[model samples]
Target chain A: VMDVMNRLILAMDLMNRDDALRVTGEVREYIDTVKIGYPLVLSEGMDIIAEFRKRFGCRIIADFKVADIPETNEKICRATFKAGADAIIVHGFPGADSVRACLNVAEEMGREVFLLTEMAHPGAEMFIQGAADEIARMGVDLGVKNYVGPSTRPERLSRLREIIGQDSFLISPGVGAQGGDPGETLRFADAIIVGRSIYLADNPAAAAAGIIESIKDLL
Target chain B: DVMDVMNRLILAMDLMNRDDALRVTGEVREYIDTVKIGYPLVLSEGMDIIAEFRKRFGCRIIADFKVADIPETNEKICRATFKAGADAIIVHGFPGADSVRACLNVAEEMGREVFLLTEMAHPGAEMFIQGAADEIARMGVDLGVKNYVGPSTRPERLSRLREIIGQDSFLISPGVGAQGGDPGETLRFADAIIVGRSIYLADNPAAAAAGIIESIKDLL
Candidate 1:
């Protein structure tokens, strides 16, 4: 069973430990990836991930929305890598060079880089469509591996899919609560980011179970 | 001495100074007719602080949230403040026209006035602000915002901003006299500006704040 970690729901609000563990336990049966969010990271620090690894030996994706100048941003990326995270995100809007520097540093440190595009925000399209083109050109030049985009619209999937191609992975967030389907979002994404709807539910494990079950068809 | 944009929120931050806020709020309270609790602080402090300050100070409590992400979020924040206690709120101009309109709609629904923070001080903000002007005007809320003003390094840019934003908009300028900006230059465009560190850092902060009040009073 291939496991995926959801980061969206958890980012929108705070979660108590019971919610955190239940959600992890539910997804552990089918998913192999766990998301380390800013809230969990900021509040729990490295301890949360340490605890998660102790319970479930899953690959961790760090989604800190890491954005800063080249040096400071890289320091954060490296810290997450050292903390045993498998992959991390750097925003695309920071321009190609900032993202490229992130990838370069990640590759050097032996971590995967996920560049954010088509963010889940409603106004993201105003700039993302063009920004995606710029990055696509850069991706062609640099041969990068993954891209993150919000899969809110079917058109977003088509627009991004055509430009970035199947080789680059997409990370989409507008699933569950925002009313986008996990399977449909995965149409343009290799994996997805799920958060609030799963963790905030009465049974986080069951909430997560519902998603893993729904999206399995697409995977 | 009259406070320029003399606000009451700074007083609350002062009372909470034992949390080490005294030095900060002490410096901030002296300059303006109003003091504002921007979202970052309100979300940090919650409505209890707003209620306490409103009950205690009899000063206008302005909530500077600059709510831009969504209508539901903005409307919720507006209704909460309207119910709990707030005289005014700040919302962003970068959001789509509908987002700004939604904020004004909620403000009206709650009978609260809204101030728009237009020209932020970030280096890259110009690109977004230029595109947002027409959309901001269409929202039908007349007050404009002036925040994120860069340091004195860009004096000419802010002076030009005073003209560009025009006198019609009520400019609430911050980052003056300690956040790497000059109040002398900021006062030109600001109808009522904000000052924090200059007074807060002084040996006699209240007097220093009163001094700023006198300066603005002379100019006005």
Candidate 2:
């Protein structure tokens, strides 16, 4: 198991390989995991995850949000794991069968699955807000231990932690430029997922180090 | 307009190689109005596959991107898909208004269409699809979106959505055989249907596609 305290997951949402490599290299010290989102996946293809895994030797999260049928979900889970991701994020919108499909692959491969119970975007209220708790409960039922909670909402994050219980983990996004503060979110989140704040920073290492410094007491 | 067609069939080219893509599109070219380039093919062969399909078949290409991200990233992805020779792209509604609006903006500028996902065809979709159906339909009206993609498994659900989006809108349903969505009833509400494995995995791809077109013709 990874050390939950003082941990950050850098969202490498860069379009170009050069930018992705440089940012991941610079912020390596501050993060415990690297989240490779769709832009990077589509821009560089699956090979990019293998390169990042070999170079950094850190846990990789493929944020594909796999939301298809059970069969398609299993295929994508296999693809992401084969590409060297330690864990993959899937959406809860597809329900238990799809979530279980990915979980089935994860169990076989000895990997992890993070269910997206709610998103960090403001407009997420359009649909996900009312359904967050239900989604979290469904994840719990399906044996999911990791979840994507919103760092911007401490109250909701706290509620999610309570619903999923203390033993389970929450990977919260919306930190950095998205207006989510590290100190506030760390109170509830097991780890914070930051993107533009670190990767887009002029001094990537320094920016990540500063956030790491603030969370040292918790660690 | 959208593209003159023999009928409303949309062949889902979920193949991994160029040869299969060319062969399947050629065999079913007379039946399908659009070729749906799903994630497997796009990731395997990149955007060039779209150009190949366009050059050979001259049919409209719908890239099944299922794009979910912030506004800027969604815009870049939508632009790239269009430039790669896709006539349209599918996006997720979960990311909410800003993401949907950004894709819409890029599609408008690039002369492409954006299809918002309201529901999926799988058994698990019941967990979140119905909860999202109302808001997604409102987004379609507010955002000026003309198309929606959902499951063909439930005709009642399709009827409710049809009323929400009104008659002028296009509905694309994907749950034919292998997934178990009945084509005849689904097409009663859907403007066009997306079928992947039923045709491609058959012994004779052309005959499988022709049979589906024939079934639709019978229904009409």
Candidate 3:
């Protein structure tokens, strides 16, 4: 339920907690949301989530890409919420039940679930592309209000936005180092996720500041 | 005697609590020797549960953590699971070869194993995963994946998976017991059958495990 600041969320993939916090802290002025997946979480432990909150005062998205049976999905969500995630990303490809298991737990714990409709990679064309629309439709029917779409695919982005309705919040990846335009992506995504472009930048604060120029006027 | 379990039933211990999981696992140790421990218990209790299962049951454990992420993150997850002492870990094929390769890489480094989960056990899997199931299996085969998991619910698909994986590679089918997949039929195509609720949640967990094993006794 967070309104992503800087119209950006940092996808922190660096494994070491010491290095991860340093890189993440440099962009504190640019991003209020830090998305950490199993890479950083497993390297440090679930406690890293609370660490991000304490240091940066930012919302943490447990980008776990939870894809499992219904019962197992619920426990992952429980563990994630307990680990201090404000929202968790759940995969829609596994089926509605797996997605629902996460949703149910999120509802119970008063957290949020962002359904990943399509991946950014070309391999998604094998099946995820064909099922992306139907999956988004299913997500809306399930009353899900947040989503993760591919920033590289503008056409899919628009279609997903339409399926979920404009009111629903949509976040996107493939924005940085992946060849996506921040201004163009913002047309469909509520916030654009930039990882290496920012994290790997020589000066991330300036890097983030430079990248936000695409929507600097909006701010 | 040890490798005989290569083609036997593996228990899917989906119970969320440590006490019940240990009790049920111990109760059925004679019938089921390998257990697929999913995130339900690991996340609820802790990674120590895998170590506990080893210390108590002295059986093989498959950490069904469902590795589904980019290659960078996948490596760390694989290392953590293997370091936690899982004999093998299950990974999803939907995320493409790079992601699966990351797990395979960590497995190679750590001397553990990876089970490529090509298809899921649910009806909704037909929407997406089933379509890519064959391609996923082919990808796994090309990537040197030695083991796989398919839907025990779909005999035809399971048979097809067996064909794609060929006779030498290992395959395990879930969706038995509670999902109405016949153990005998599942074993026709899979090296092992994964059973969860039908055994663990039954009035008599041991009896349920016995009956399921008996049903597949002819295959044994």
Error of 2 at A50 (Å): 1.2
Please give, for residues B123-187, the per-residue lDDT of candidate 3 as tens digits.
77876788889999999999999999999999999999899989989888899978889989888
Q: For candidate 1, give the DockQ.
A: 0.12
lDDT by residue (tens digit), candidate 2, B1-220:
3443347778888777778878878988877768888776766666677878878886888888787766767887887788777888999887788889999999999988999988777777777777677678778778888889878887788888888888888888888877888888888898878899998888888899888878878754
Error of 1 at A125 (Å): 5.0
- Candidate 1 similarity to native, TM-score: 0.60
lDDT of 1 by residue, B154-192 (tens): 556555555565556555566566546555566665555
TM-score, one value per model: 0.60, 0.93, 0.90
Q: Could you tell me how far off, in angstroms, the CA of residue B151 lies in candidate 2 after the best superposition? A: 2.5
For every prediction, compared with the true complex, DockQ reads 0.12, 0.50, 0.50
In model 2, how large is the Cα lDDT of residue A58?
77
Q: After superposition, which runs of candidate 1 have C-alpha atoms over 4 Å from their true positions?
A: A1-148, A154-170, A176-179, A190-210, B1-4, B7-18, B22-33, B39-47, B52-58, B77-84, B126-168, B179-181, B201-204
The candidate maximizing TM-score is: 2
The predicted structure with the larger TM-score, 2 or 3, is: 2
lDDT of 2 at B120: 78
True-structure RMSD, every candidate: 7.5, 2.2, 2.7
